[PDB]
């Protein structure tokens, strides 16, 4: 301690952050349930196409989900914590439509698939423009005043 | 600067998730190590079920490694850090026991997977507890601010 | 609020994190490129050399990101800022190498994958140092007075 704390500066992102990890749990646990509906044992990722789906889908959702993690800190600290929180959920909610979709068919991955990368791109864009305003007037201020040298 | 920083409130989830990169980095070279054993050339990720043992026990660590790290962090700050801390070490002795385990038979990858399992959830739960102890006194009031009148 | 704020403290971090984004960002849209070109439609990771080239290439990237991530942000905080920062951007322009030789040849992947290890190496080193010099000395002041008892 510190006597004061900056957790109410971050806990949307958090609560945010800990619905995701769920949703990734949930995934995994689906996996699972899938191997043994299957019977596709480890080590071992192929199987039936309706196997493979759904393994792909978790797969897919795990390796963009610390470009969501980072995007969302980065555009709640240096943008607004609401508005990139609230992306956060619509990414989310489009994540679980993609796996859901995905394991029924490979055509239903697309439409959620192109909701989560509106979202995802959004956070991108607010974590860009708070990072701008951030270092811009620094920068342009340095410059000027090289130049100011009459 | 500051005159103050919050690093003393972070520096064991800190050091926590630096064993974890370490791990992760030793998962690494094994799997290197078995494509040399075994003859497995990039691209390419199949071949005996030994070599495909050590690549998938690798792959399931990597996946499960940002759940991980997220929810380290956010029971470690909304919780307690030392707790979290300490189910850190837990999960990540019990990844390192998967490996090594899987690696041997995918039989053995099952008491350590489920050892790594109740240690996040542990986190997971120390999380949950630590956003509702932030979000819920404040929530109560205003509902109830708001039946105030009379 | 808070009448101060840690950003400056972590800007470039964030930063570098938000440019690691975009280059995996970038390394998706071309495995999609590739599933096109080649035409390997979901789920199914195989195909021609070439196709498994782009997808493995993307594949490494993303299971190392985390990492880079993780190690970025504790070098970052315990060790040095800038000097974190500048490891990261040497990392993730080796990753870029990696990924468009790896796409050409499986031998084109080795010399920078190579350069990116030396630079994720550096970070895991000064994320050491960094939490060695915050632990060392008050443990160290411990055990000496623990032996003072005459
Ligand atoms: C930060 C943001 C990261 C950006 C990630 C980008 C993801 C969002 C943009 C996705 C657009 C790509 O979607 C595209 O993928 C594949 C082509 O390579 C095709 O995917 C298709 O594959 C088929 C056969 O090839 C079938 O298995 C499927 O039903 C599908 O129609 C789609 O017909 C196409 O619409
Ligand atoms: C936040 C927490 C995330 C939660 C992750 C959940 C992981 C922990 C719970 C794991 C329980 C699942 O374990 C389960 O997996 C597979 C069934 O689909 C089976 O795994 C089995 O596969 C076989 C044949 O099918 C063999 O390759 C193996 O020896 C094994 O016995 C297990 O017999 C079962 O016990
Ligand atoms: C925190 C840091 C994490 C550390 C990650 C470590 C990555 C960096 C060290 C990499 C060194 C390993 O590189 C090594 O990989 C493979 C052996 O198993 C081989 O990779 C080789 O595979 C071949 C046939 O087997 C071909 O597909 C390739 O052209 C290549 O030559 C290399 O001949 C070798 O040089
Ligand atoms: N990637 C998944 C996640 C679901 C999961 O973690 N399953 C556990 C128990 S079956 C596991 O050890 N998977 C083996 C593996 O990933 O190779 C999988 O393919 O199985
Ligand atoms: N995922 C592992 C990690 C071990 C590793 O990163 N190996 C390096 C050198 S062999 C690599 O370029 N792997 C190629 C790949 O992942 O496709 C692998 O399958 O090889
Ligand atoms: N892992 C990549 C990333 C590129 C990507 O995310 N593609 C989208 C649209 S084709 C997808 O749904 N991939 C299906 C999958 O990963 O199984 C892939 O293999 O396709
Ligand atoms: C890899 C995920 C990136 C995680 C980065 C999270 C680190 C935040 C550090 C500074 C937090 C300071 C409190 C917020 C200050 C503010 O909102 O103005
Ligand atoms: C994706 C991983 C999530 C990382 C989030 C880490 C960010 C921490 C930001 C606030 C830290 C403030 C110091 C701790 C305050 C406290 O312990 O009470
Ligand atoms: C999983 C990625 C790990 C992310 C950890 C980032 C959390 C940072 C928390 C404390 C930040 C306080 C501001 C910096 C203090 C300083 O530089 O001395
Ligand atoms: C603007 C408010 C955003 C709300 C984020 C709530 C997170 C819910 C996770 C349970
Ligand atoms: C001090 C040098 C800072 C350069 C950082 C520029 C980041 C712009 C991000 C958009
Ligand atoms: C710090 C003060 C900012 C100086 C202003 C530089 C002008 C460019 C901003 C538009
Ligand atoms: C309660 C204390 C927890 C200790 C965490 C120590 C981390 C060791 C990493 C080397
Ligand atoms: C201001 C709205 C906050 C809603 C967040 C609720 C999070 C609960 C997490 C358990
Ligand atoms: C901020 C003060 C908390 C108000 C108390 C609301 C009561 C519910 C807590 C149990
Ligand atoms: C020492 C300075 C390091 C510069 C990091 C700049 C990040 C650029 C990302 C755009
Ligand atoms: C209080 C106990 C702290 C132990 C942490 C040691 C971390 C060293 C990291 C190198
Ligand atoms: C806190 C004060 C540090 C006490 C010094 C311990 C000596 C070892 C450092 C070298
Ligand atoms: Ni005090
Ligand atoms: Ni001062
Ligand atoms: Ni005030
Ligand atoms: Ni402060």
Same mark, same amino acid.
């Given at each position: 301690?510190?006597?004061?704390?900056?957790?109410?500066?971050?806990?949307?992102?958090?609560? @945010?952050?800990?619905?995701? @990890?769920?949703?990734?749990?949930?995934?995994?646990?689906?996996? #699972?349930?899938?191997?043994?509906?299957?019977?596709?044992?480890?080590?071992?990722?192929?199987?039936?196409?309706?196997?493979?789906? @759904?393994?792909?889908?978790? @797969?897919?959702?795990?390796?963009?989900?610390?470009?969501?993690?980072?995007?969302?800190?980065? =555009?709640? #600290?240096?943008?607004?914590?609401?508005?990139?929180?609230?992306?956060?959920?619509?990414?989310?909610?489009?994540?679980?439509?993609?796996?859901?979709?995905?394991?029924?068919?490979?055509?239903?991955?697309?439409?959620?698939?192109?909701?989560?990368?509106?979202?995802?791109?959004?956070?991108?864009?607010?974590?860009?423009?708070?990072?701008?305003?951030?270092?811009?007037?620094?920068?342009?201020? =340095?410059?000027?005043?090289?130049?100011?040298?009459?």
């Amino acid at each position: 301690h510190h006597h004061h704390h900056h957790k109410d500066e971050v806990a949307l992102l958090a609560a @945010v952050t800990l619905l995701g @990890v769920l949703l990734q749990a949930y995934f995994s646990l689906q996996v #699972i349930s899938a191997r043994r509906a299957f019977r596709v044992s480890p080590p071992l990722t192929t199987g039936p196409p309706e196997f493979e789906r @759904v393994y792909r889908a978790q @797969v897919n959702c795990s390796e963009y989900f610390p470009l969501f993690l980072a995007t969302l800190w980065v =555009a709640g #600290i240096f943008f607004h914590e609401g508005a990139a929180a609230l992306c956060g959920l619509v990414y989310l909610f489009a994540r679980l439509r993609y796996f859901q979709g995905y394991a029924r068919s490979a055509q239903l991955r697309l439409a959620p698939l192109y909701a989560s990368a509106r979202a995802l791109w959004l956070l991108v864009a607010l974590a860009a423009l708070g990072l701008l305003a951030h270092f811009l007037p620094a920068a342009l201020r =340095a410059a000027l005043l090289g130049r100011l040298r009459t």
